[PDB]
Amino acid sequence: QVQFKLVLVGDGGTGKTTFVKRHLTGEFEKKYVATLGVEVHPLVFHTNRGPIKFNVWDTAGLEKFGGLRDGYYIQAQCAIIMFDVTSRVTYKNVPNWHRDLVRVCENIPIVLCGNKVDIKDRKVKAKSIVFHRKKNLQYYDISAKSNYNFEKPFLWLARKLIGDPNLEFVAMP
Amino acid sequence: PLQLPPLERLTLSQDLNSTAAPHPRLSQYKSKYSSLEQSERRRRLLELQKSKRLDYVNHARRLAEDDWTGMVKKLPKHYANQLMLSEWLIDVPSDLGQEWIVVVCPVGKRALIVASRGSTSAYTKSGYCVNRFSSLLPGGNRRNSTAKDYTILDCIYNEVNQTYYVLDVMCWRGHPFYDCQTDFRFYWMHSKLPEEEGLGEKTKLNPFKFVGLKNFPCTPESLCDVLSMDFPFEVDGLLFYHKQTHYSPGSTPLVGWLRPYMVSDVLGVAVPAGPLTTGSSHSPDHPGCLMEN
Amino acid sequence: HAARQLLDFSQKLDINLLDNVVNCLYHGEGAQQRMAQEVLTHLKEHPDAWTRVDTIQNMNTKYYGLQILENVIKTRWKILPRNQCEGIKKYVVGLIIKTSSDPTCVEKEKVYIGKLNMILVQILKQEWPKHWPTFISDIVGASRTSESLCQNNMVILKLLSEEVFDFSSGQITQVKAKHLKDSMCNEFSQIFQLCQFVMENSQNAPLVHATLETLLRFLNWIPLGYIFETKLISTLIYKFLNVPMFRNVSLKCLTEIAGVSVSQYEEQFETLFTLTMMQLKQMLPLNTNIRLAYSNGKDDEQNFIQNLSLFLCTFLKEHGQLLEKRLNLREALMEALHYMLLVSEVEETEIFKICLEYWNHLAAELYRESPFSTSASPLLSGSQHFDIPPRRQLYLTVLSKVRLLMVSRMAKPEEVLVVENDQGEVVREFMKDTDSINLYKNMRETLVYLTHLDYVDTEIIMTKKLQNQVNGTEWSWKNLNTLCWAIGSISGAMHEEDEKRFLVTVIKDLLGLCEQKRGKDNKAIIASNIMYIVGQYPRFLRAHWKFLKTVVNKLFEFMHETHDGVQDMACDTFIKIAQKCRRHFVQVQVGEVMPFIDEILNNINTIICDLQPQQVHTFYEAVGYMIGAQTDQTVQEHLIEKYMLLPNQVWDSIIQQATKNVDILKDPETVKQLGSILKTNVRACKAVGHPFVIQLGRIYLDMLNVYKCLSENISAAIQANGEMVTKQPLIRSMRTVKRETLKLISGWVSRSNDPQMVAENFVPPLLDAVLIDYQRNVPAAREPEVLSTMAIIVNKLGGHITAEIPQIFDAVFECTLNMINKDFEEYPEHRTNFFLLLQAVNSHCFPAFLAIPPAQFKLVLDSIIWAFKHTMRNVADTGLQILFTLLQNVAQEEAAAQSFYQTYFCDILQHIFSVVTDTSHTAGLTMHASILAYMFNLVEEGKISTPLNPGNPVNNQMFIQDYVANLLKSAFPHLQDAQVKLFVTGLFSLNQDIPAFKEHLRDFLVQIKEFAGEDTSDLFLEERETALRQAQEEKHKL
Ligand SMILES: Nc1nc2c(ncn2[C@@H]2O[C@H](COP(=O)(O)OP(=O)(O)OP(=O)(O)O)[C@@H](O)[C@H]2O)c(=O)[nH]1
Ligand SMILES: [Mg+2]
DSSP states (O other): OOEEEEEEEESTTSSHHHHHHHHHHOOOOOSOOOOOSEEEEEEEEEETTEEEEEEEEEEOOSSTTOOSTGGGTTTOSEEEEEEETTOTHHHHSHHHHHHHHHTTOSSOOEEEEEEOTTSSSOSSOGGGOOHHHHHTOEEEEOBTTTTBTTTHHHHHHHHHHTTOTTOOBOOOO | OOOOOOGGGOOSOOOTTBTTSOOTTTSSTTOOTTOOSOOHHHHHHHHHTOSOOSOHHHHHHHHHHTOOOOOOOOOOSSSSSOSEEEEEOOSOOTTHHHHEEEEEEESSEEEEEEEETTEEEEEOTTOOEEEEEOOSSTTSSSSSOSSSOOEEEEEEEETTTTEEEEEEEEEETTEEOTTSOHHHHHHHHHHHSTTSTTTTSOOSSOOSEEEEOOOEEOOHHHHHHHTTOOOSSOEEEEEEEETTOOOOSEEEEEEEEEOHHHHTTTSOOOOSTTTSOOOOOOOOOOOSSOOOO | OOOOOOOTTSOOOSTTHHHHHHHHTTTSHHHHHHHHHHTTSOSSOOTHHHHHHHHOOOHHHHHHHHHHHHHHHHHTGGGSOHHHHHHHHHHHHHHHHHHHSOSOTTTSTHHHHHHHHHHHHHHHHHHHHHHOTTHHHHHHHHHHHOSHHHHHHHHHHHHHHIIIIISOBTTBOHHHHHHHHHHHHHTHHHHHHHHHHHHHHOOOHHHHHHHHHHHHTTTTTSOTHHHHSSSHHHHIIIIISSSGGGHHHHHHHHHHHTTOOOSSOHHHHHHHHHHHHHHHHHHSOTTSOHHHHHHTOOTTHHHHHHHHHHHHHHHHHHHHHHHHHSSTTTTHHHHHHHHHHHHTTOSOHHHHHHHHHHHHHHHHHTTSSOOSOOOOSOOTTSOOOOOSOTTHHHHHHHHHHHHHHHHHHOOOSOOEEEOOOTTSOOOEEEOSSOHHHHHHHHHHHHHHHHHHHOHHHHHHHHHHHHHHHHTSOOOOHHHHHHHHHHHHHTTTSSOHHHHHHHHHHHHHHHHHHHHHSOSHHHHHHHHHHHHHHHHHOHHHHTTOHHHHHHHHHHHHHHTTOOSTTHHHHHHHHHHHHHHHHGGGGTSOOTTOSSOHHHHHHTTHHHHHTTSOHHHHHHHHHHHHHHHTTOOOHHHHHHHHHHHTHHHHHHHHHHHHHHTTOTTGGGOHHHHHHHHHHHHHHHHHHHHHOGGGHHHHHHHHHHHHHHHHHHHHHHHHHHHHHOGGGGSSHHHHHHHHHHHHHHHHHHHHHHTOOOHHHHHHHSSHHHIIIIIHHHHHSOGGGOOTHHHHHHHHHHHHHGGGGTTTHHHHHHHHHHHHHTTSSSOSSSSHHHHHHHHHHHHHHHHHOTTHHHHSOHHHHHHHHHHHHHHTTOSSHHHHHHHHHHHHHHHHHHHHOHHHHHHHHHHHHHHHHHHHHHHHTSTTOGGGHHHHHHHHHHHHHHHTTTOOSOSSSSSTTSOHHHHHHHHHHHHHHHHOTTSOHHHHHHHHHHHHHSTTOHHHHHHHHHHHHHHHSSOOOSSOOOSOHHHHHHHTHHHHTSTTTO
16 A cells, blocks of 8 residues: 655645644644644545555745745655635735646646635635646645535545546545 | 416325324325225234244344344334334224223424443434433443343433433343233333332433333223323323234334324313413513522 | 754765755654754855755755755845856856756756756846846757757746746836846747747657747747747647647647737637637547547546637637638537537536536627527518527527536535534534535526527426436436426526426426335435425415415425435425515415414424424524514514424523522533524524514523523633533533524624614623623633624624723723733634624724723724734734724824824834735735825825924925835845835825835835845836836826
C-alpha cells in the first residue's frame, strides 16, 4: 500500500488546516491559528484495492508566514487549491497559487476546493467559479464544518494516481 | 365537472384494517380494497396455523446481540417491525366475553425495549433508537450477566410519568416467550415485574420506571367498570387480545384496537367518562417557579 | 541536532546544509527542525549563493540557493552596485546557457531550469528595457542558431509574458507595468517572426509544442493584427490540429481566439469556424459515441472533449449570432449544434456544466425573440403561418433534442445533508447554494424557457418518458426520479388549464404504476415521486380542495409507515403544502362544515405518535403556518392555545415539580424534554409570527428562571472541573435548553410588530436573567449566542432600546472584552458576535455612545481598532463597517463632531495605515481605501478646528499631509522622499474615486517591499504627477 505527496495551498483562513484536522481527528477547529511554513500530516483511506496514504503538506496562506514557499512543492504527486466562498479575494488569488504550483509540478492531478458552503451568506456564487475549466482541474463544493463532500477531493485524486476510475473508500481494517 | 385521480387507493402495504388510517366506518363504509369487514375467519386460520416452523430462540439472540449474519413466514432482520400490531376491532368476536381480554393503553410511544450486554435500548416501530440508558431489567444494567441473559419488551413510553408501560413480553431472562399464548405472557408480566428490586422506581441505575399495564375481562359487565376507572395516565385507547395468541410481529386480527368513545357504540355500554369524544399600564404574565428576577 | 549554520564569518561548508534539505523532504518529525532552520537562514544575505549553486540529491539544494538569489533581485537590486547587478546578469544568463544548453534538462528537473528562467524574468522585470537593450534581439538570434537555446527561450518569453500581462497587477506598480507593456508591444514583431518561422519549418516536436504553448499565453494581449491579418489561424487548423500530440494546444489557442469581443474581423471568424469543423468531422466522426470515447479514454482523449466543449460553446455564444445571417454557414452550424448534443451525453459534471451554459443562453436568446408558442392550427389556405419567429426556426429540431436532454439528465433539486450539530444531536440539514443545486437551477431554467416556446413538445417528451416507465419498461428508480424532478421543475410554466390536463394524466398513470409494481421497495419510490409532484403544484391543490384533502390524509397515513425515508418524505411534503395552501386549512371549504385545522388539532397525537423528535418539530411548524392564516384575532387565539396544548402539559408538569425541588432541572430526562419542548416552541413561532406572543408570554418568566438555573449549574460544574466537563451528555444537554431559549427569544422579537410593548415587557426580564447571568458566568461558561441574541433585538427595537444600552453594555461589554484582548485566537464565536452587537448598537442606537463618559466611549472606539486588526476576515471587516459607519454617525451632530476630530482623527488615521501596510489584511483593501478617501475628502472642508498648536499657520490639509508623510516616512525610512510625497499627494487627489484610490494603495504596498534607493530613480513622476490632477480635476468639472 504505497503513498503519495499532497500539497495543500490557498489564502489564509481558507480552512486548509481545519480541513486536514477533521480528517484525522474528526474534530472541528473553531479557532484561527495561522500555520507557520508547513505541517506535514499523513492521512490514510482504505479502498477496495488496498490502503492508501496521503502526505498532506498543509502549507501557509499568509505572506509573512510563507516559508520556503515554492520550495515545498518539489516532488509533489497531486495538489489541492482551496478558497473561501465567503471571500471573493481568495478566489481571485487562486490563479496565483496554481501558477507557482505548476511551474514546479508540470503535470499532477489537482483539485480546486470551495470551502465554507455551510455558511448561508455565500459571497462567491457558483456561476463565477470557472477557473478550473481551461486549466483542466477538478472542482468540488466542500465544508469542513459539515463534512459536505468531505472526501471528494481525496477520492478523485486516488482515482487518478492508482489509474482506477472505480476506486471506492470503504474503511475496512 | 372535474375528474381527479383516485389518490386514496395509493398504499404501501397490504395491511387489512390498518390503524394507520381512520376507522373503516368513517372514510367510506366498505372502505377500500386492503380493508375488510370480516376479521372472524382469518383469526381461526391464524390460530389453527399455530404450530412452530420458526426459530424464535435464535431470533431473540440476534435482537439482543445485533447479529444478522444469516447463518406467517419470516422474521424482520433488524429493529424495525418487531412489535405485534393490531387492526381496528371490526368483526366483534362472538366469544369475546370469555376468550378475549382488554388492556387500557396510555398516551405515549410504542417501543421495542432491548436489554442485553449491560445496556437497555428503546426503538420505535420504525426501528429508530429513541434512548439508550441503564435499567434494572435482566441484562440492562452495568451489573448483570455477560452470559446469555437478555430481555425484550413491547412497551409504551409516557413522557409526563417518565414511565415505560410494559404491554407484553417476548423474551425474559434469556428465554423466548413468542411461543406462548397471550394468556400466559400477561400472567408472567404481572408476576415477574413486581418481583424486581426497584424496577418500578427511579434511581441512578434505573432512571425510567417500568410499570406493567393491567388487563381486564371483556364481559359486558366488566367493560362497564373499566370505562369508569382511574388510571395513572391519560387514556388513549383499548387493546383486545385473544387469550390464545402467540406473539407475531406485524398486523394481526387476533388483537384489536378501539378508541374509548367507540366502545359504547360498537358493543353496548354506559357513556360517562372516556366515551365523551374529543399611572397604570397592562403587563400580564405570572411565574410559578418564582426566583430572584 | 541543532546544526544552526548561520555562523556568518565561519568558513561554512556545504555537505551539511545538503543533509538538512534531504530531511526537509524525506525524514519526518526531523523536518520540523529542518524547515525551522532553512527558513531562518534568510537573515544576513546570500554570500553562500555562489558557493552553493557552484559546489554541486543536489538540485533540490540548488533550488534552495536560487530562492535566496531570487529574493535579492526583487528586494535590493536597485541599490546594488551597478557592476554587481551586471555580475549577476552574466552569472544567470550563463548559468542558464550552461544548464539550458545542457544535454539532459529533464533529469536536472525542468524544476531547476524553470526556476532559473524565472530568475532571469525576475531580472528583466527590473531593467530589461533601459539597461538590457539588446536583450530581445539577442535571444532571437540565439534561437535561430541553436534549437536547444531556442526551445528554452520559448519558455523564457512565456514567463515574461505572464509576469507582465497576466500577473502584473499587485506585484508591479501601475505606471511601471505600462512601461513594460509598451516595451513588449514595441518589440513583439521580431519575436512573432520567430514563432512563425518555427511553426512552418521546425521538425522538432518539443520545440514546436513549447512554441504553440508560448503562443497560447500571447493571445491574451498581442495586437489583433497578428491573429486575423496573418496566416496564424490557417497554420493551426491545417497543420497542428489534426495531429494527436498537438490537438489540445491547437484547440485551446483557437478557443482563446474565438472569444474575441470585437466587430472588426467578421470574415476571418467565418472561415476559422468552417475550417475547424472540417478537421473535427475527420477527427471525431459525427456518428461516434462521445460518451464512450470519454468513459474509455485517458488524460488526452478526455481533455480534448473538454476543450471541444469550451471551443464550441465559447464560439457559438459569441459569433454564433452571425452564423445565422449568412446562408453558406447554415450547414456547419447544424453540425456544430450536433456535437454539443453528443458531448452533452458525457457522464462528467464539469463538461455537462459547460454545454448547459450554452443551451441556457440559446433558449434565452430565443425567448426574447418571442416568448410565445406558435399558433398550432394552420391557415385556411393550407400555407405556413410564419408564426415561427426568424431565428428559432433554425433551431426547431435541435430544441426538441435539448428538451429531451433536460428531461433525461435533470439534476436532484434539493440536497439533504445529515450531520450532527455541536451537541451530538443528529439532524438533517438543507443546503442552499451548493454547486449541485445551481446545476438544478440552470436545468430547470433552460427547460422553463423551452416550455414557453413550445409546451406541447415538453408534455409529449414527458408523456413518452412516463409511458416507457409504465410499460415501455425502461423502468428503474434512477430514471423515474429524474422524470418527476423534471416534471416538477416546470411548475407554473403552463397556462393553468393546460397544467390541469397535464397533472391529472401524469399522476393518474403513476397511480397505476404503483399498483402493478410489487414489493414495498418499488411502491415507496413511486409514492414519493407522486407526493413530490403533487407538492410542486399548489396552484392545482388550491383549486381542488377534495384533492388537497385526500393528499393531506394520505400523508397522515404515510406518517405511520415504517419503510425507510417514507416518514421524512411525508413530512417534507406536508410542511411544503401547508406553507403554500395555508389559507384553505383555516377557512371552511365546500362540502365541509368545519375548518380542516380542527380535525388536525383534535388528532395531533394519533397522527404524530410514531414520528421521531425532529419530524414532530417539522409537523408542528407545518400546522403553525395554517394558524398564521387565521387573521381573525379571537379565533387565532383559541387555535394557538390548543396548538400548544400538548407541549404545554410537559412544561407545566416539569415546572410544578421544579417549584418543590430545583434539583429536578438537573435531571437528564427532564432536561432532554425541556429541550424538545423548546425546540417545538421555536418552530411554531417561526410560522405563527407575532400572534405567537400569547404563548411566549404564558411561559416567558419561568423559562428565564430555568435558563438561569441551568446557566448557573453549568458554570459551577466548569469552575469546579475545568472546560472538560462541557464535553459530556448532561452539560451539552443543558447548553441546549439555553441555546433554544435564546433562539426563541430572538426568533420572536424579530417577527414582532410593536417595538415599545416589546421594550417595556419582554426586555427588562432579560437583563437579570440572561445578561447579568452571562456576566457572572466563568469565562469558559458564558454563552456566545447571548451577544448575538442581543444584537438581533437592537436591530429590531432600535431607538426603543437606546436607553438600555447603559445597563446592557455594563454586563457584557468590558467582561467580554477581557476575553478577547490577549491575542487574536481564543473564543472565536465571542469575537464574531461581540462585534455584531457593537455594530448594531452603533448602527441603531448611536445616541448611547454620547450619553456615556468620554472614558467609556474611548474604550469603545479602541475596541473597534482592535476589530480591524484581526486576521479573521469577518471580524476585521465588521470593524471597518463599524468604523466607517461611526465616522458618518459623527458627521451628524455638529457639536460633538469637532471634538471627535480633535481627539481621534489622527489616532484613527495612523491605525488604518498600520493595517494597510501589513501584508495580512489585503482583503479589506476596498473598505480601507473607502474610509481614508472619506477622511481626506473630509479634510478639505469639514474639520474646522486646529489640529496643531499654532492656529491658522497650518491649515488642516497641510498638517495632515505632513503628519501622514512623517508617519509613513518614519515607519518606512528606506523610501525616498519623492516616493512618499507622491503618495501623500495622491490621497487628496484620488479622494473621489475609490477604485483609483485603491490602486494607489496597492502601489505603495509594492514600493515598501522594495528598497527603491535614492540611487536608481526608475519611477515616473511628471507622468504620474500630472495623471493625478486629471482625476483631481474631475471632482469640480462635471
Ligand atoms: N463556517 C465555517 N468555518 C470554517 C470552515 N472551515 C474552516 N472554518 C473556519 O475558518 C478558519 C480557518 O482556519 P484554518 O483552517 O487554520 O485556515 P488555514 O487555511 O489553515 O489558514 P493558514 O494556515 O494561515 O493558511 C477557522 O476559524 C475555522 O474555524 C467551514 O467549512 N465553515
Ligand atoms: Mg494551515
